């Protein structure tokens, strides 16, 4: 077989964040912020970085 396989992998990531401000006001939601490397490998489901699937009575 001799089979290499990479599922859902993050390699080699350099980041410099300098004097970044940030402000979040959230109510019942999903929020994702900033420097964001993401590998996903979902099987038989909903892959998703920000998911908001609920009721909010404001």
Considering the complex, what minimum distance in angstroms separates the CB of residue 49 from a second copy? 5
∠ CA(27), CA(29), CA(31), 5° rounding? 110
∠ CA(29), CA(10), CA(48), 5° rounding? 25
Query: Do 33 and 22 meet the contact criterion of CB atoms below 8 Å apart?
Result: yes
41 known ligand binder: no
Interacting positions 1-58 with a second copy (CB under 8 A): 1-58
Number of residues that bind a second copy (CB under 8 A): 58
Q: Which residues are annotated as a binding site for Cu cation?
A: 11
Binding region for a second copy (CB under 8 A): 1-58
Q: Which residues are annotated as a binding site?
A: 11
């Amino acid at each position: 077989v001799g089979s290499k396989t990479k599922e859902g992998v993050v390699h080699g990531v350099a980041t410099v964040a300098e004097k970044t401000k940030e402000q979040v006001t959230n109510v019942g939601g999903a929020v994702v912020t900033g420097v964001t490397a993401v590998a996903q490998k979902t099987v038989e489901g909903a892959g998703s970085i920000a998911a908001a699937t609920g009721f909010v009575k404001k």
